[PDB]
Design an enzyme around this catalytic site. Structure first.
Site, PDB file in Angstrom:
ATOM      1  CD  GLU A  94       3.253   6.473  -3.086  1.00  0.00           C
ATOM      2  OE1 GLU A  94       2.998   5.452  -2.417  1.00  0.00           O
ATOM      3  OE2 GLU A  94       4.030   6.451  -4.057  1.00  0.00           O
ATOM      4  N   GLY A 122       0.805  -1.205   0.000  1.00  0.00           N
ATOM      5  CA  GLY A 122       0.000   0.000   0.000  1.00  0.00           C
ATOM      6  C   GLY A 122       0.840   1.257   0.000  1.00  0.00           C
ATOM      7  CB  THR A 123      -0.198   4.750   0.350  1.00  0.00           C
ATOM      8  OG1 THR A 123      -0.699   5.485  -0.771  1.00  0.00           O
ATOM      9  CG2 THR A 123       0.409   5.709   1.378  1.00  0.00           C
ATOM     10  CB  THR A 124       5.605   4.569   0.550  1.00  0.00           C
ATOM     11  OG1 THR A 124       6.518   5.560   1.044  1.00  0.00           O
ATOM     12  CG2 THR A 124       5.452   4.723  -0.999  1.00  0.00           C
TER      13      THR A 124
END
Lengths: 243, 231, 232, 198, 244, 196, 204, 222
Positions: E47, E30-32
Site C-alpha cells: 500500500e 506503517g503502510t500495510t
C-alpha cells in the site's frame, strides 16, 4: 545509580541480575523438551506449537542439526536460538578442520558455555535467552547429553528436561532412574527409546500428542537426524497399541 | 565492586587446602545441581601443570575459563622459553595478574572466585597459595574459603602442626569437609587431589630417567570411600 | 578539583595511612629499611612473601606501604628500567633516575584522569657512585624527596617525631639499625614486637672491601638483632 | 674512505681526521671538521657513507646533550660509547642501516684517565691505546706497535702522530688534504691548528 | 530502581527486550504489505499512501529486488527497509560469488535473521523499524518468509504486516482455507490486489496506489519481475468489483 | 601425477595412479590421489601434494559448514569453491584438480580446474603429468552414457597407458565409483593392468 | 664477507671429574687485520658461563642481552639461574630470530648447584642444542679443535689435569688458524671455586 | 640423517640414527632425533636440526593444552593436522621432515610430513639422507602383520643400512615402541655398533706443560 540491574555486573549480594533475567526468557516460547540415553542412541523430544494457520510447520523448528554427529535443541526465543546454532555449526566445522577429528559433544558444550560466560562478564554484550541441550553418540563417551545455560554453566545429564513445566517432567524421570538404578534406558533400537521419551512426557504433562505437536531428534552412531511428520505418527501408533 | 565479588565467593560451595611436610592437599564438594546430572562430567579440582593443581569457591564458569586461561599462560610465558614448567609461586603470580586486570580494566567485572592453587617446584618445595578476585594472593599453611570458611578455618588452626605427613592432612581435610557438607558425603560428592610423590605410573611412557612423572594425583571415587570407612 | 585539590589522590594518600608502616634511616656508611606486616593469621605462611620489601637491583631496594597487588605492577616495570639502562650504557642505573622514572608513571594517572591512581608509597634505599648512599620517598602524588630518615603509612606523624629526636649525622650503620627498631617501639598497634611481624634490609659498605653488599634479612637474622633489645 | 685516527696517551686522547671531502671526481672541500663534540670532555670523529655519516653523529650529539642537560651530569665516556654502539647495532638489522664508523675519545672525570673507543658500522666496539678505521690502520699500526708507550706525555704523543700521517702521505694513493688534530683532556676539547708544519 | 527499556540489549525482569517491542509498534503504524505463496512462486503487494497530489504516480517504488529471483517488501520506517535490503544484497552476492548458485531462499532468510538479531545485542544500536516480507523461487520451489525486528522469522503460506495487519491476515486465512493446494500464480495476483484494497479501510483517510511484484516458475521463469500494464489493471479492476 | 574422471548412465567414476615422485625417487608408491570432500563429491589431485592437500582440506571444511547451514551441496558448488581458491591464489599454487560427483538430478557431472584457475565442465577429463599420452586414446575410445563396467574398463586402459609411458606415474590404479547406491572404491594391481 | 668468519675466534669446553672448563682466544679482527688482543669471548651470569664466537657486534649484543634476561630471572625467581635452564633459554632466545639470526656459535658450561653435576652444551645460530658428555667446540677453528679434542680427551680428568688438556687443544688449533690467537684465557670451574688463567702463545 | 617408521599388529615403532652433520663435519655423534609430542605420540626429525625440535616443542605444547580442554587423550591425527598446516603457512621455509606415529583411542597410526606440508599415510616410511638405503631394506623384509620383536629388528636393520651406506648418517640407533595396550617405550641407543676402539696412546699431559702468564680467581656469587 540503580544500574547494576541493567548490565552484567555485580549486585551488592554477588548476583548477576541480567543473567537471572536471561534465564526467565528461555520459557518465553512455552515449549518443553526432554532428552534420554539408550544402549547406543540419544533422543530429544520437543513440543511444536503452530498457532497461526498461515504458518508452514516445516519451517518451525527448535531442533538444529549442528554436525553429522551432533544435535542441539534450544529453549528460547527463535532469534537467539539461531544465533547460537549458527555459531556452533561453525565452531564444530572449525574444530574438525583444525584438529582432525569430528567435534565431540561435551567439547562443543564447554565451548558454548565458555562463550555464554563471556557475556556474563562483559559490560557491553548480553547473554542469550537460550538453554542449549546438546546430544550425540560421541565416539569415546557413548550417548551424550550436555546442557549449557545463560549463566555459563554446563554439565552432563543421564537425561534432562527444560522449560516451563520443567520440574514436572524432571521429577518423572528421576523416579525412573531411582527404579532401574542405572544411567540409561535399556532398549536397543532407538525407536523404542523414542516411544519411551514420548510416553514419559505424556505421563508428565497430562496431555496427548498428535503427529503435529512434537519434534523429534535422534542420534545414533555416525548420524544425527530428525523424524518427519510421519516417522512420528508411527511412533505414536505403537504407543497407543500397548497402552 | 571488588568487594561484591568477594561476596559471591563467600557463598558457594566450601573448599580448602592443607600443606604438609611431604605433600599438599586440596578438596571441595561436588554439589549436584540435580540427581539426573552425572557429577563426574564436571571437575572442581583441575590440573594446571603436572606439579600444580587448583580448586575454587564460587562461580562455576568463571573458574573454568580461568583454569583454561591459566594452563595456557603456563606454556606461553614459561615452558616455551625455559623448557621447564613454572614454579608454584610464579604461575600463581601470572594468574593474579590475570584477575587483577579484570579488575582495573573497563567494561569487565572481576571474577567471582577465590582460588586455592597447590604445587611443588624443585627449588621452593611445597607451597599452597590463595588468589582472590582483587588480584591479591597469599601463601598458606592451610585455609578454607566459601560458606564453611569460618568453621573450617578454625578447625584447621586447632588441628594443624608443622609435622604433618600428607596422609595426616588427607585425614584432616576429610573431617573438615564432613562438618560443612551440604549434600551427601561419599566419593561421588567429594573431589580430592594431592601434590605428593612423583607418580611414574602415570607418565604414559618409559625411557628417560630424568623426568619422573606427575606429582599431582586426583583420588578416584574408590580411594575416597576407602578412607571414609576407616574414618 | 575544587580549591586546587588532587582529590582521587588524597583518597589513596590517606588509604596509605591505613595499611603498613615503613621506615628508612640513612647512616654515614650504610642505609636501612624496615616494615611491619599486615594483620596476620596463625596459619599464614610467614617465610615466603617478602611481601613489603622488594629488591629492584643489586644496588637498590624499596619498602612498600600500600596495596600489594598494586606495587608489584610498579616494581615489575622498575626492575626493567634498571636493566634497560644497563644493556644501554653498561653502567648500573643511578638512584634518582630510577626514582623519577616511577614518580613519572605515578603522576601519569594523576592527570590522564581516565584510569585510577596508585596505592602504595615507597621508601627507596640505594647506592650509586655519583651521590653516595641515598634515601628517597614516593607518594602517588608524583613527588619525590630527599631524606636522612623517613616513614610512611599508619602512625606516620608519630614516628617522624622520635626519629627527629634520636638521629645524629655521625651515625654508623648498626646505630641506625637500632634507631629503626627502637622507634617501632611506639608506632606499633601490636603491643610487643615480634620477629614475624617484621621484614628488614641493609645496604652496607660491603662485608669486605670498598664496595656494596645488599641484604634482605632472613627471619632468624631478625630474631637475632631483635635480641639487641626489642624482645629477648 | 677517509682517514680516522686516534691515540690515547697518559693524560689525554688525540684524534686525527682527514680534511677532505670528495664527490667522485672533484675534491669539494679542503677543510672538513669530521667530528662533533658530544659534551665538554667527549669527542667523536667519524667516516663512512656519504650522508649517513653526519646525520648519525648529530643524532648522537643531540641525545647526549639531552642526557647532560637532564641530569646535569656529564655522561662518562664508557657510557657514551656503549650507547653509540647499541644505536649502531640496532640499525644493522634495520631497513636502511647507518653505514658509519666512529672513534670516541674523552676524559673520564671520575677516574681521571683518558679513554679511546673504536666502533664500526656493525656495532663492533673495543677499547684501545690507538685505533683507526678504513685502511688507515695498515700503514700506521706498524709504527704504533713499535713506538708506543702508555706513559707518553701529550707532547710525546703528538710527535708520534705526525709520524703516522707522514707515512700515510707517502704510501697512500689518496690525497686526503691533511688532518685536523683535536685533543681531549681534563680541561676539555681543544684543537691544534698548527700541525702540517709543527 | 528501573529504566529497563531505554537500552537495547537489556532484559526486563521477565525475559523481554523492550526496545524491540517498541519497534514492532512502528511496524504496526506503517503502510500495510502482504505476501502470498502459490503453487509455483510468490506474489507481493504493498500500500503506497499519497501524502499530496504532487506525489508522482507509479514513480515511488517500495518493493525492492534482491539478486534476480528474490523479492522484499516492508512496512514501517522505510529507510530501515533500505538499509536492511542493502545488507541483504551484499550477503546474497557473497554467497553467489563463492558457491556459484544464487542464494537459496531459506539460506537468505537465515542471513537477514542474523543481521537483525544482531541489532538486538548492544545498548548502542536500535532494532530495525520494519517487519520484512520476502521470498522467491529456489532449487526446491517457492518460499515465503516474514521477519520482525526481534530477528524472528518463519515460513508462511501467506503473511501480512502493517496497519491493516489483522484485516489481511484474516482474508489470507480465508484462501488457505478454500484452496489448500495454493492459488494459481495469476490468481494469487488478482487476490493480493483484493486484500490490499480491503486492508485500506483501516487507513481510509488518504489515497493510495497499489504495487505488485511476483516471482513465478511458470509466469516469469523463476525471476522476480514486477506486475505492470494490462495485468495490473486486470487486478485493480478485480478489486474494485469486490469492494462494491 | 596421472588422473582422470568419466561420466555415465548411472553416475561418475574417478581414477588415478598412486605415484608421488620427488625427483627420480618414488617417495610413496601407494598414494590416495582420490580425495573426498563430501558423501558423493570427490576430487582428483595432481600437482604439489602439499598444495592439493591443503586445498581439498579447506574445501572439505567450506562444504561441511555449507551442509550445516544451507544443506546438501550441488556438485557445481564444490567446483566453485575449488576455483575460487585456485584462481584467487594462482600466484602461489601449482595444482590441477578434477572435481566429480553425483546428485540425483544430473547424475554424472565432471569439472576440471587446470592450473590457471579456470573451470571447465566436461563429460570426462584427464589431467596430471602423464595425461599427455592418452589425449589420443581417450578421444577415440570415450562414449557418452556407458555402462558401469564399460567405464571401469575405459579407465583401466587409459591409465594402463599413461603409466607405461610416464615415469612420474605408476603404482596401483585406484578408482572410486559414485552412484545412487553408494560409494565403491576400486583397486587394480600391476600384474593386471600391464597385461593389456 | 662471511659473518661467522670476519672477526673469528674460537671457544672450547670440556668435562672432567666433578668439574668443567671453558676457554677462548682474545682475538678480534676485521678480515686479515687484527684490531684487539684483549677481546674476551667468555662471559658469566651467576655460576653459569657462556662463550660465544662469531660476529663481534652479535657476541657483544647477546652478552648484553643474557645479562639482562638472567638478572631478572634472579629477582623474579628468587634464585640464580641453572645451566640446564639457561641452555634452554639460549635456544628459544636464538630461535626467536630464526629468519635473521645472530651469527654466533654459543657454548654453555657450568655446574648445577643442586645436583653438583657438570654440564656443557653448544648451539648453532638458530638454537639447536647439542648436549654432550665429552666436549663442545665452536668458531673459525671448528675443525681443528674437533681434531685436538678427539685425541687429547679422556673423561673424568682431575681439574689440574684438564687444564693442561683443554689448554693444549685450544692453543694448537689457533696456531693452525689464521683468524684465531693473540692471547687466550681458560676458566677452570670447580664446585665452588673458579680459576681464570691467561696463556702464552705465539702472536701471529 | 636416517629415520624410519614401521607399523605392526598391535602398534607402531619408529627409529633413527644419531649423527648430526654441519656440512662434512659431525657435530653431535649422538643427538637423539626422537622427539616426544605427547606421551604416546612420538616423531622422528630429519632436516634442519633446530626446526624439527622447535616445531615439535610447539605442536606438542598446543596438543598438551588441547588434551586438557577436551579431557581427552591426544590423537596422532591431531598432531598431524596441526603440523601439516603450520609448515604450509610457512611456504616450505621451515625445514622439517618428520615421521609422526603413535597410539590414541583410535588405534595405531603412522604418517610422514614433508616441509612444504604434504602428508603420507603408510605402513613403512623413511625420510632423510639415508632414506634410500633404509627403504631398500624395508622393501625387502616387510610382510603384513609383523610382531613387536620382528618390527623392531626391521626398523633397526633399516637404520643400520643408513648408518653404513650413507655418509649423512651414523653412530647409534634410537628406537621408540608404542604398543596399543601399553605405555610407550623409548629405548635410547638401543644399538651401539660404532664404539671407538681404544686409542694407541694416552695424551694426558704431565702437569705444568702449559705456559701461564697471569692467574687469578673470579667471584661467583655476590
Amino acid at each position: 545509580a540503580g544500574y547494576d540491574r541493567h548490565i552484567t555486573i555485580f549486585s551488592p549480594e554477588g548476583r548477576l541480575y541480567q543473567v537471572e533475567y536471561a534465564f526467565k526468557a528461555t520459557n518465553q516460547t512455552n515449549i518443553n523438551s526432554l532428552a534420554v540415553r539408550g544402549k547406543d542412541c540419544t533422543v530429544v523430544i520437543s513440543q511444536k506449537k503452530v498457532p497461526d494457520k498461515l504458518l508452514d510447520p516445516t519451517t518451525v523448528s527448535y531442533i538444529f542439526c549442528i554436525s553429522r554427529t551432533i544435535g542441539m535443541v534450544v529453549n528460547g526465543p527463535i532469534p537467539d536460538a539461531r544465533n547460537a546454532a549458527l555459531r556452533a555449526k561453525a565452531e564444530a566445522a572449525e574444530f574438525r578442520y583444525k584438529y582432525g577429528y569430528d567435534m565431540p559433544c561435551d567439547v562443543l558444550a564447554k565451548r558454548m558455555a565458555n562463550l555464554s560466560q563471556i557475556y556474563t562478564q562483559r559490560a557491553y554484550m548480553r547473554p542469550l535467552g537460550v538453554i542449549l541441550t546438546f546430544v550425540s553418540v560421541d565416539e569415546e563417551l557413548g550417548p551424550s547429553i550436555y546442557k549449557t545455560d545463560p549463566a555459563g554453566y554446563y554439565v552432563g545429564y543421564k537425561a534432562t528436561a527444560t522449560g516451563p513445566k520443567q520440574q514436572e517432567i524432571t521429577t518423572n524421570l528421576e523416579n525412573h532412574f531411582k527404579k532401574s538404578k542405572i544411567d540409561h534406558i535399556n532398549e536397543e533400537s532407538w525407536e523404542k527409546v523414542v516411544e519411551f521419551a514420548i510416553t514419559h512426557m505424556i505421563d508428565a504433562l497430562g496431555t496427548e500428542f498428535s503427529k503435529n505437536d512434537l519434534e523429534v531428534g535422534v542420534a545414533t552412531k555416525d548420524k544425527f537426524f530428525t523424524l518427519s511428520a510421519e516417522n512420528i505418527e508411527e511412533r505414536l501408533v505403537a504407543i497407543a497399541e500397548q497402552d | 565492586q571488588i568487594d561484591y565479588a568477594l561476596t559471591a565467593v563467600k557463598q558457594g560451595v566450601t573448599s580448602l587446602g592443607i600443606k604438609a611436610t611431604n605433600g599438599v592437599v586440596i578438596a571441595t564438594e561436588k554439589k549436584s545441581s540435580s540427581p539426573l546430572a552425572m557429577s563426574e562430567t564436571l571437575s572442581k579440582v583441575s590440573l594446571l601443570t603436572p606439579d600444580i593443581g587448583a580448586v575454587y569457591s564460587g562461580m562455576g564458569p568463571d573458574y573454568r575459563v580461568l583454569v583454561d586461561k591459566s594452563r595456557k599462560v603456563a606454556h606461553t610465558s614459561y615452558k616455551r622459553i625455559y623448557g621447564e614448567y613454572p614454579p608454584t609461586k610464579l604461575l600463581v603470580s601470572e594468574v593474579a595478574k590475570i584477575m587483577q586486570e579484570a579488575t582495573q580494566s573497563g567494561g569487565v567485572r572481576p571474577f567471582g572466585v577465590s582460588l586455592l592453587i597447590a604445587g611443588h617446584d624443585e627449588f621452593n618445595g611445597f607451597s599452597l597459595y590463595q588468589v582472590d578476585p582483587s588480584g591479591s594472593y597469599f601463601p598458606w599453611k592451610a585455609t578454607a574459603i566459601g560458606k564453611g570458611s569460618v568453621a573450617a578455618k578454625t578447625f584447621l588452626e586447632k588441628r594443624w602442626n608443622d609435622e604433618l605427613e600428607l596422609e595426616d592432612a588427607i585425614h584432616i581435610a576429610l573431617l573438615t569437609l564432613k562438618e560443612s557438607v551440604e549434600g551427601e558425603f561419599n566419593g561421588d560428592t567429594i573431589e580430592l587431589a594431592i601434590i605428593g610423590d612423583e607418580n611414574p605410573d602415570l607418565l604414559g611412557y618409559t625411557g628417560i630417567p630424568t623426568d619422573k612423572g606427575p606429582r599431582f594425583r586426583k583420588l578416584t571415587s574408590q580411594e575416597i570411600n576407602d578412607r571414609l570407612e576407616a574414618l | 578539583s575544587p580549591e586546587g585539590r588532587l582529590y582521587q589522590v588524597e583518597y589513596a594518600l590517606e588509604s596509605i595511612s591505613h595499611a603498613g608502616t615503613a621506615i628508612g634511616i640513612m647512616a654515614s656508611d650504610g642505609i636501612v629499611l624496615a616494615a611491619e606486616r599486615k594483620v596476620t593469621s596463625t596459619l599464614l605462611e610467614q617465610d615466603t612473601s617478602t611481601e613489603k620489601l622488594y629488591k629492584l637491583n643489586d644496588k637498590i631496594a624499596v619498602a612498600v606501604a600500600g596495596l600489594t597487588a598494586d606495587a608489584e605492577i610498579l616494581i615489575n616495570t622498575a626492575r626493567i628500567h634498571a636493566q634497560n639502562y644497563l644493556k644501554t650504557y653498561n653502567e648500573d642505573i643511578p638512584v634518582e633516575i630510577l626514582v623519577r622514572r616511577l614518580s613519572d608513571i605515578k603522576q601519569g594517572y594523576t592527570q590522564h584522569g581516565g584510569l585510577r591512581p596508585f596505592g602504595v608509597s615507597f621508601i627507596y634505599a640505594g647506592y650509586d657512585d655519583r651521590y653516595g648512599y641515598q634515601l628517597y620517598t614516593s607518594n602517588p602524588s608524583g613527588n619525590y624527596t630527599g631524606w636522612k630518615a623517613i616513614s610512611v603509612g599508619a602512625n606516620t606523624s608519630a614516628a617522624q617525631t622520635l626519629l627527629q629526636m634520636d638521629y645524629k649525622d655521625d651515625m654508623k650503620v648498626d646505630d641506625a639499625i637500632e634507631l629503626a627498631l627502637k622507634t617501632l617501639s611506639k608506632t606499633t598497634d601490636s603491643s610487643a614486637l615480634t620477629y614475624d611481624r617484621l621484614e628488614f634490609a641493609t645496604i652496607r659498605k660491603g662485608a669486605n672491601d670498598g664496595e656494596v653488599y645488599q641484604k634482605i634479612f632472613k627471619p632468624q637474622e631478625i630474631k637475632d638483632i631483635l635480641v639487641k633489645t626489642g624482645i629477648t | 674512505m677517509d682517514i680516522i685516527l686516534g691515540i690515547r696517551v697518559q693524560d689525554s686522547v688525540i684524534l686525527a681526521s682527514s680534511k677532505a671531502v670528495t664527490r667522485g671526481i672533484s675534491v669539494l672541500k679542503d677543510s672538513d671538521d669530521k667530528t662533533r663534540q658530544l659534551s665538554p670532555h667527549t669527542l667523536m670523529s667519524f667516516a663512512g657513507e656519504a650522508g649517513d655519516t653526519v646525520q648519525f653523529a648529530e643524532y648522537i650529539q643531540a641525545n647526549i646533550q639531552l642526557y647532560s642537560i637532564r641530569e646535569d651530569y656529564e655522561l662518562s665516556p664508557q657510557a657514551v660509547s656503549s650507547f653509540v654502539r647499541q644505536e649502531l647495532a640496532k640499525s644493522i638489522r634495520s631497513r636502511r642501516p647507518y653505514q658509519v664508523n666512529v672513534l670516541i675519545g674523552g676524559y673520564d672525570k671520575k677516574k681521571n684517565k683518558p679513554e679511546l673507543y673504536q666502533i664500526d658500522y656493525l656495532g663492533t666496539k673495543v677499547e684501545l691505546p690507538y685505533g683507526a678505521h678504513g685502511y688507515s690502520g695498515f700503514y700506521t699500526f706498524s709504527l704504533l706497535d713499535h713506538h708506543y708507550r702508555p706513559d707518553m706525555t701529550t707532547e710525546e704523543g703528538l710527535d708520534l702522530l705526525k709520524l703516522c700521517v707522514q707515512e700515510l702521505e707517502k704510501r697512500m694513493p689518496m690525497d686526503f688534504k691533511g688532518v685536523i688534530v683535536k685533543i681531549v683532556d681534563k680541561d676539555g676539547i681543544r684543537q691544534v691548528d698548527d700541525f702540517q708544519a709543527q | 530502581g528501573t529504566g529497563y527499556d531505554l537500552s537495547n540489549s537489556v532484559f526486563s525482569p521477565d525475559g523481554r527486550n523492550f526496545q524491540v517491542e517498541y519497534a514492532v509498534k512502528a511496524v504496526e503504524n506503517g503502510t500495510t504489505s502482504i505476501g502470498i505463496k502459490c503453487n509455483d512462486g510468490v506474489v507481493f503487494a504493498v500500500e503506497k499512501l499519497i501524502t499530496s497530489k504532487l506525489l508522482v504516480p507509479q514513480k515511488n517504488v517500495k518493493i525492492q529486488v534482491v539478486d534476480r529471483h528474490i523479492g522484499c517488501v516492508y512496512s514501517g520506517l522505510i529507510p530501515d527497509g533500505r538499509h536492511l535490503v542493502n545488507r541483504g544484497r551484499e550477503e546474497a552476492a557473497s554467497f553467489k560469488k563463492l558457491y556459484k548458485t544464487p542464494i537459496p531462499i531459506p539460506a537468505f532468510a537465515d542471513r537477514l535473521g542474523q543481521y537483525v538479531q544482531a541489532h538486538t545485542l548492544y545498548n548502542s544500536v536500535r532494532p530495525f523499524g520494519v517487519s520484512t516480507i520476502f521470498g522467491g523461487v529456489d532449487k526446491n520451489g517457492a518460499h515465503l518468509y516474514m521477519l520482525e525486528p526481534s530477528g524472528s522469522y518463519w515460513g508462511y503460506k501467506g503473511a501480512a504486516t502493517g496497519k491493516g495487519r489483522q484485516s489481511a491476515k484474516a482474508e489470507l486465512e480465508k484462501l488457505v482455507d478454500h484452496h489448500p493446494e495454493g492459488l494459481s500464480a495469476r490468481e494469487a495476483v488478482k487476490q493480493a490486489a483484493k486484500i490490499i484494497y480491503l486492508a485500506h479501510e483501516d487507513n481510509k483517510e488518504k489515497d493510495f496506489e497499489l504495487e505488485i511484484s511476483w516471482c513465478s516458475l511458470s509466469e516469469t521463469n523463476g525471476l522476480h519481475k514486477f506486475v505492470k500494464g494490462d495485468l495490473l489493471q486486470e487486478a485493480i479492476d478485480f478489486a474494485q468489483k469486490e469492494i462494491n | 601425477a596421472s588422473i582422470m574422471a568419466v561420466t555415465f548412465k548411472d553416475g561418475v567414476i574417478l581414477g588415478a595412479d598412486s605415484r608421488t615422485t620427488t625427483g627420480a625417487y618414488i617417495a610413496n608408491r601407494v598414494t590416495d590421489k582420490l580425495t573426498r570432500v563430501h558423501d558423493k563429491i570427490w576430487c582428483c589431485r595432481s600437482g604439489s601434494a602439499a598444495d592439493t592437500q591443503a586445498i581439498a582440506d579447506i574445501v572439505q571444511y567450506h562444504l561441511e559448514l555449507y551442509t550445516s547451514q544451507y544443506g546438501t551441496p550441488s556438485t557445481e558448488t564444490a567446483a566453485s569453491v575449488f576455483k575460487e581458491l585456485c584462481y584467487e591464489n594462482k600466484d602461489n599454487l601449482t595444482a590441477g584438480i578434477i572435481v566429480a560427483g553425483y546428485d540425483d538430478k544430473n547424475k554424472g557431472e565432471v569439472y576440471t580446474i587446470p592450473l590457471g584457475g579456470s573451470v571447465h565442465k566436461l563429460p570426462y577429463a584427464i589431467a596430471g603429468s602423464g595425461s599427455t599420452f592418452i589425449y589420443g586414446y581417450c578421444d577415440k575410445n570415450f562414449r557418452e552414457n556407458m555402462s558401469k563396467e564399460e567405464t571401469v574398463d575405459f579407465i583401466k586402459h587409459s591409465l594402463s597407458q599413461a603409466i607405461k609411458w610416464d615415469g612420474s606415474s605408476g603404482g596401483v590404479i585406484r578408482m572410486v565409483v559414485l552412484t545412487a547406491a553408494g560409494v565403491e572404491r576400486l583397486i587394480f594391481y600391476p600384474d593386471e593392468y600391464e597385461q593389456l | 664477507s662471511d659473518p661467522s668468519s670476519i672477526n673469528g675466534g674460537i671457544v672450547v669446553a670440556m668435562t672432567g671429574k666433578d668439574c668443567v672448563a671453558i676457554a677462548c682466544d682474545l682475538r678480534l679482527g676485521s678480515q686479515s687485520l687484527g684490531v684487539s688482543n684483549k677481546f674476551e669471548k667468555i662471559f658469566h651470569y651467576g655460576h653459569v658461563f657462556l662463550g660465544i664466537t662469531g660476529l663481534a657486534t652479535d657476541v657483544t649484543t647477546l652478552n648484553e642481552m643474557f645479562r639482562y634476561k638472567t638478572n631478572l630471572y634472579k629477582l623474579k625467581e628468587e634464585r640464580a639461574i641453572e645451566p640446564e635452564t639457561f641452555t634452554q633459554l639460549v635456544s628459544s632466545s636464538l630461535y626467536e630470530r630464526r629468519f635473521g639470526p645472530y651469527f654466533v656459535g654459543p657454548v654453555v658450561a657450568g655446574i648445577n648447584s643442586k645436583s653438583g653435576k657438570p654440564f656443557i652444551a653448544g648451539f648453532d645460530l638458530i638454537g639447536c642444542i647439542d648436549e654432550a658428555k665429552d666436549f663442545i667446540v665452536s668458531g673459525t677453528a671448528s675443525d681443528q679443535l674437533f681434531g685436538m679434542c678427539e685425541s687429547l680427551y679422556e673423561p673424568n680428568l682431575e681439574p689440574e689435569d684438564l687444564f693442561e688438556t683443554i689448554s693444549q687443544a685450544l692453543l694448537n688449533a689457533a696456531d693452525r688458524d689464521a683468524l684465531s690467537g693473540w692471547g687466550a684465557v681458560v676458566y677452570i670451574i670447580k664446585k665452588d671455586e673458579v680459576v681464570k688463567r691467561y696463556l702464552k702463545m705465539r702472536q701471529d | 640423517t636416517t629415520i624410519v617408521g614401521v607399523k605392526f599388529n598391535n602398534g607402531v615403532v619408529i627409529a633413527a640414527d644419531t649423527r648430526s652433520t654441519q656440512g662434512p663435519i659431525v657435530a653431535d655423534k649422538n643427538c637423539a632425533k626422537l622427539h616426544r609430542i605427547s606421551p604416546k605420540i612420538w616423531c622422528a626429525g630429519a632436516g634442519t636440526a633446530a626446526d624439527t625440535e622447535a616445531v615439535t616443542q610447539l605442536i606438542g605444547s598446543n596438543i598438551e593444552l588441547h588434551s586438557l580442554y577436551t579431557s581427552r587423550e591426544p590423537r596422532v591425527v591431531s598432531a598431524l593436522q596441526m603440523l601439516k598446516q603450520h609448515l604450509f603457512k610457512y611456504q616450505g621455509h621451515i625445514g622439517a621432515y618428520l615421521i609422526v606415529a603413535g597410539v590414541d583411542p583410535t588405534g595405531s597410526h603412522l604418517f610422514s610430513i614433508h616441509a612444504h606440508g604434504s602428508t603420507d599415510v603408510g605402513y613403512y616410511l623413511s625420510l632423510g639422507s639415508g632414506s634410500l638405503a633404509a627403504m631398500a631394506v624395508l622393501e625387502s623384509h616387510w610382510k603384513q602383520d609383523l610382531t613387536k620383536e620382528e618390527a623392531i629388528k626391521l626398523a633397526s636393520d633399516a637404520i643400520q643400512a643408513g648408518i653404513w651406506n650413507d655418509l649423512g648418517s651414523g653412530s647409534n640407533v634410537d628406537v621408540c615402541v608404542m604398543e596399543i595396550g601399553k605405555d610407550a617405550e623409548y629405548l635410547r641407543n638401543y644399538l651401539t655398533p660404532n664404539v671407538r676402539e681404544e686409542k694407541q696412546k694416552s695424551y694426558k699431559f704431565p702437569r705444568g706443560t702449559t705456559a701461564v702468564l697471569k692467574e687469578s680467581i673470579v667471584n661467583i656469587c655476590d
